[PDB]
Amino acid sequence: DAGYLTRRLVEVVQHIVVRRTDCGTIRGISVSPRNKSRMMSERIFIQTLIGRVLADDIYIGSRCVAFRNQDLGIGLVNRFITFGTQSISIRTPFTCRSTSWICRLCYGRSPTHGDLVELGEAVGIIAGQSIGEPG
Amino acid sequence: RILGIPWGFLIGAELTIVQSRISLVNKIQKVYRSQGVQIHNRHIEIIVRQITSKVLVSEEGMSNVFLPGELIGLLRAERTGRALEEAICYRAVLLGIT
């Protein structure tokens, strides 16, 4: 079953390759730490945000603490949690202006190489293998 | 019924797809986290993006640009929505990975 599942997972995204540096999108998924229905677990708030590229500037008072098109380090996330930053706009695969390829900024940092993802990387097959492998 | 020209189809499809993506990732991550499996959100978001990237031309939207029942991309559907008023009627469809 997992072998069948893995083949279909790789199949649907086999053509996804990092082919542009920046698609030029302005949309950004909003991430909020405080929700009045549940006290958010800070651990989930961190690991998802690490490696994401901000879609909008972040301000504390009249001071800019994080700029647009900037990789989200763990220091920035803690600074966002330390202060009352209720909205974080990030660039994700859901925000890219294409379903046949993805850009470097909408993907984020490389899963293994530490820096931003490089052009020509077959991130779709890596995504398919990463999910089907532990099945 | 509230909004007419494409703001009915555009906003309806946008709201359906945005909600679908949030719940699709949550359900998949909930299954794997229950088994101790650690997968980054990027890998699942790559898969879900292909699930929620199409809309279905409704059975009454007939023109020389689209035919009813035709499976077209979401971005193409919204771009033609702002440029034409030729019955560009569509609804978001969820496709399986097969």
């Binding site: 909003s30 909205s87 | 020209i5 906003i11 946008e14 709201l15």
Partner: peptide, 29 residues
């Protein structure tokens, strides 16, 4: 302009959903 005026978990209420999309920056006027 008329539709822009009328436009002003995502809740099931359509106008609450519109306000949520405005707050979550999904869609705006």
């Amino acid at each position: 302009e008329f539709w822009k005026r009328r436009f002003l978990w995502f809740p099931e209420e359509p106008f609450e959903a519109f306000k949520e999309m405005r707050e979550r920056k999904v869609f705006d006027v």
